[PDB]
């Protein structure tokens, strides 16, 4: 129930933490995939603007 607000190609978008599948660390940024209903979608936020739950998911994915 944590919401990640991200800009994709100049369009403001929002995806809940529960919908996110893959999270990666790319430089200063957190790039990710989520499940927009049947399809998969992609987005990214900077690590500075990221909510705590997203960053915890990132750390989990780095084991």
UniProtKB/Swiss-Prot annotation:
GO cellular component assignments: cytoplasm
Subcellular locations according to the entry: Cytoplasm
Positions where N6-methyllysine occurs in the chain: 5, 7
Major subcellular location class: cytoplasm
Gene Ontology MF terms: DNA binding; RNA endonuclease activity
Domain of life: Archaea
Keywords: Cytoplasm, DNA-binding, Methylation
Temperature note: Hyperthermostable.
pH dependence: Highly stable from pH 0 to pH 12.
Gene3D superfamilies: 2.40.50.40
InterPro entries cross-referenced by the UniProt entry: Chromo-like_dom_sf, DNA-bd_7a-e_arc
PTM comment: Lys-5 was 70% monomethylated in form 7a, 25% in form 7b, and 20% in form 7d. Lys-7 was 50% monomethylated in form 7a, 40% in form 7b, and 50% in form 7d.
Keyword Cell membrane: no
Note: Sac7a and Sac7b are truncated versions of the Sac7d protein, most likely resulting from post-translational processing, or degradation during isolation.
Subunit structure: Monomer.
Similarity comment text for this entry: Belongs to the 7 kDa DNA-binding/endoribonuclease P2 family.
Reported function: Can constrain negative DNA supercoils. May be involved in maintaining the integrity of the genome at high temperature.
Protein name: DNA-binding protein 7d
Organism: Sulfolobus acidocaldarius (strain ATCC 33909 / DSM 639 / JCM 8929 / NBRC 15157 / NCIMB 11770)
